[PDB]
Assembly symmetry: C3
């Protein structure tokens, strides 16, 4: 017999002590570890006391399957009040992430063919590969200047300028000149603006506008000033492509955003909104799991040689046809699944369930907030034997086990672009370099809206030839 909602284990804490500790610490850096500990202590399902609303936390793929069933025509997410507040203030339309209901479905169906569809990936994958090549060849040049034919560095800046370049070329069809050169003032300010926006989000996110208004008004300024820079960067991108297309409609493929603009299925204000989400949403999301793959490969050399052997065999066919990298690199794809399992940028999946459902034999009423904690999900030994072990082979021996890009209609729009940028950088890196590190210690993870590593390790890149 199905147990009532109230029968479920309750989180020991409270929404006020959480609020005050956030005001204090100016963040919630250990949210992932807090929830992971709660799951260890209470079970794979528990309810958070919001003093009225219903909030459930899950960590099982069987529970994600049940959630997808309830999804409905319009899967609902929680309204991200601080973000929506900026758009309302400056008079901008919302992108597909911040949209809900029919307006969301209208935007999404017009976006999927150009951003996510396999036909679209066939078109922008050769562009991504071009930037991926330029990354390794720039590195190789620097590596060969040193006597020991290797360069030791913090790869993070390079990886970020790669994700900026690769995304810009995929969206707008413009080479920014970031890969292989000194970072732009515009790029650094953009990267900093995102970092601040994400930090301030957490600060304003866990309390109503009515409270945060007077408790933290300085944070609201910080947040909006940060968005002002993100939008300044984004609008510059759109103003360029909109003028270029206005005078000449090209024959060939010149990016995702060009497609959207040419089709004119969405309004300019809708294209502007979604273009913003894609320009800013492609930077930190792709670059952090890439840094974590490079680290884990430098940590697990045995895995690195297996992936290198694969990348060297398939090297020739990928050189002739880049779009073959998706199919001819099954282990490298599996390594990325493993990086996202242990290090999810998207700590939790979120749905304000549209109808009643039953999770772990507990009644979950309609309107209930359901959060799928990916950190805990990926770290349960029952479903991932030896979960601490970085093993891509586990994804080849074996269904909702791999949900880092979400699920259903609402699943990550930039999923296939991110995978493409990640696969191709790594394929080109494995082909020429050996990634090595003395930092064998686990990198601590920090919650700043995105689950980012706290520290960047020193990585050696030894030239194979």
């Amino acid at each position: 017999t199905v147990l009532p909602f109230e029968a479920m284990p309750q989180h020991p804490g409270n929404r006020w002590l959480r609020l005050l500790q956030i005001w204090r610490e100016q963040g919630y850096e250990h949210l992932h570890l807090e929830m992971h500990q709660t799951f260890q202590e209470l079970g794979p399902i528990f309810r958070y006391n919001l003093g009225g609303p219903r909030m459930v936390c899950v960590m099982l793929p069987e529970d994600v399957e049940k959630l997808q069933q309830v999804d409905s025509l319009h899967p609902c997410r929680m309204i991200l009040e601080p973000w929506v507040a900026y758009r309302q203030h400056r008079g901008h339309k919302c992108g597909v992430f911040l949209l809900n209901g029919p307006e969301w479905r209208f935007n999404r169906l017009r976006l999927n063919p150009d951003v996510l569809s396999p036909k679209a990936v066939q078109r922008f994958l050769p562009m991504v590969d071009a930037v991926a090549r330029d990354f390794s060849q720039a590195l190789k040049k620097k590596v060969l200047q040193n006597a020991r034919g290797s360069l030791t560095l913090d790869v993070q800046p390079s990886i970020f300028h790669y994700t900026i370049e690769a995304s810009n070329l995929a969206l707008f069809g413009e080479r920014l000149g970031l890969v292989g050169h000194s970072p732009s003032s515009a790029s650094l300010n953009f990267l900093h603006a995102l970092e601040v926006m994400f930090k301030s989000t957490v600060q304003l996110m866990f309390m109503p506008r009515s409270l945060s208004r007077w408790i933290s008004p300085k944070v609201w300024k910080e947040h909006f000033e940060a968005w002002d820079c993100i939008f300044q960067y984004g609008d510059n991108c759109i103003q360029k492509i909109y003028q270029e297309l206005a005078f000449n409609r090209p024959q060939h493929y010149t990016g995702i955003v060009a497609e959207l603009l040419l089709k004119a299925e969405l309004s300019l204000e809708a294209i502007k909104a979604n273009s913003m989400e894609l320009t800013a949403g492609s930077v930190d999301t792709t670059a952090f799991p890439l840094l974590m793959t490079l680290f884990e490969l430098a940590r697990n050399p045995d895995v690195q040689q297996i992936l290198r052997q694969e990348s060297l065999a398939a090297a020739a066919s990928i050189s002739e046809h880049p779009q073959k990298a998706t199919t001819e690199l099954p282990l490298l794809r599996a390594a990325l699944k493993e990086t996202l399992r242990l290090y999810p940028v998207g700590l939790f999946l979120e749905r304000v369930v549209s109808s009643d459902l039953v999770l772990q034999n507990y009644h979950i009423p309609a309107g209930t907030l359901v959060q799928v904690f990916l950190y805990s999900l990926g770290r349960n030994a029952a479903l991932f034997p030896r979960p601490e072990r970085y093993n891509p082979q586990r994804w080849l021996d074996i269904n909702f086990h791999h949900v880092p890009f979400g699920f259903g209609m609402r699943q990550c729009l930039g999923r296939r672009l991110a995978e493409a940028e990640m696969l191709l950088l790594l394929h080109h890196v494995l082909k020429h370099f050996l990634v090595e590190t003395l930092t064998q210690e686990d990198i601590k993870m920090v919650y700043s809206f995105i689950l980012r590593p706290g520290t960047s390790p020193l990585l050696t890149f030894r030239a194979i030839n």
Copy 2:
């Protein structure tokens, strides 16, 4: 004939010197000056007198009045003493350049400068150098353009155009490649450009009131002005110290710039060469730079005109490639397009002359010693002088040869005191545009008129987003 009316019979400007300075104190500038004077001409006629509470000041806007002004232009045409600029030079112990000199000292400097800066023989010598930089500008742009999928680059051209005018001028004056065209701007270049911007801003603030007033009303502006000049002179002295040392050890056979010829001739003192060299180094940046941009804008706005100029530049492309000095003669339309850009958008704004002997302008008696200002903005926008004045049409300057319109094109002034860098500016402007027209299509969605700002120079308020589409690719 009809009775010549006295000076006092002339319409008087409604405002006053005191309120004007109070406004400039408040606003920290006179950005609307051109529009203020243009409105005054609409309301009072083509001649009016400004009350300076003692001195005689007349304002004109007709070419017929410019003709009468040159008649009075003596052996030594003299202008108003630019007190703030002069003040810096006497404080730091520098000689004055032509622009700041008057009388015999001016004529002595001017006659020794004209053969190497302005003469056609000098233009034949520095033109191939300018063309070399003009080529490098387009080829650097083409490289950037071809990296993008749509084979076009959309940008604010202003920074590029400024680094072109700095590079082109430096190569023409000192025979040195600064490496600005096609590369990241220098800290020196950016600080120099900023220093000029500040100097021009502070000029407007101090030049509308006596030293007796500005010393207490705005002493902070005097500091701001001199600190700005300190940077301009630091840049300028570096240029001259280099060429002076280079020539001291080896006198070259070939042409290596304007300033090299002045130094080799030694007709002027080192302090006179230093003074004039400064005026030419700083005076060649913002001047050539703003009309060149307004041309790019107007062409992006007038595609019909652009294709006519491109067709011309493509036909003459081969002969200009063989001999760059042919660009002056073989590009008559592109030359007239520049006349049209300066007609609408004069970087000058006005021409001063503190008249040497009595004259009559618009049937009014203009006594000796009267300051006369020719407002070029108003002159160029006059519908009776230029039919459909808002229309950008280079063809209006072509079959006017022996039609009396000799005084309609006066953006570089007139007479002996006419702009010294006239022919260098025209060369930098023609050649950049010829090389740009040959490879790119200039396009813009910004069809709305750019507002002009008065900050000593008449500069655009905003810089538009311009697309440069590769014609070939």
Copy 3:
């Protein structure tokens, strides 16, 4: 008959007025000229009143000779209290410069074979030559873009980025990409940190910690903040090479520091300490005599053509084998001896005498601090006929302790042969392609900021020869 210590003429000034003038001026820029004037007024030997300790000042090679014989198995220098204070505070070991006694000798003997030995010079010389070439070819490129086929500039920044690049490649075997490109934020901050550290040394150097701690505490902060930047730069260099070697021990030569790490004769903390002294101690030291040689050559065109003729004849053999530059450039080597004679970056040699000695017929007791002022020594009209005249040929006649800019004995400069290599090769490659010229014929004023550096940098023209 030998004269007592007290019989020696005494410096007119005092410990306290010195201290206060350094407090007021925030430096002792004129020290060299002060001591040089004192020698002119008092003789070639005088004593400084420290109000207890014995301090003697000398300027004759005969006195250096006598100092060498008193040099024990462990020659002593004065403990540089501010520097030692940083290492003690942050828990770092001391390098061979800051060490004394047996600990010094232990470090020294394990350093000499890889840093100073001729066998080591044969290994790092081709690396230095590679950077020296890149310097001239980068210059040539810029020179040829100008109409008069010459570039006029302040060479100082370029020369500094050369010493940084050349030293880094020699020590760690890493190309920093400084030569021929825009200076790094890291390099500029490093150069600035050194400048500050040296300035703040002079300020804290002439008074005890007991006093400097309250009379100038702000200076102690700026000194340590400066060292923090120097150590941040240095530690990155080490952390890179230590990780690189941990995964693969190379077959070929990949720098000085690599050979020390591979030998493991010294502890990692000892290698770190000495590696820091070599990384920071090779920037300013090589740069200033290099910049001064360029200056003296532009004002001595006659000398320049002699050195150029030599460098052009030997050009081919040096191209085939760079290590031949040491032997096949005797005049260029002699020009460097002349640059250091008039422009000693050292300024004064120092020894805390281990046993009694007699200098200039005066009794010098054990424990007495003896300072050899190289500026005055090199400007002595009686041993250097027409001392103000720049003449490399005076080092070739030979009739001997006249050339002591790298010190003397076991304690003689560890980076002597690396500095000479960087200096010779830059100049050889510059002489081969350019003519150095200047209108600045007037002597550059020298400044004392721990190192003897030129106060002003002159404008130097580099005319392409063909």
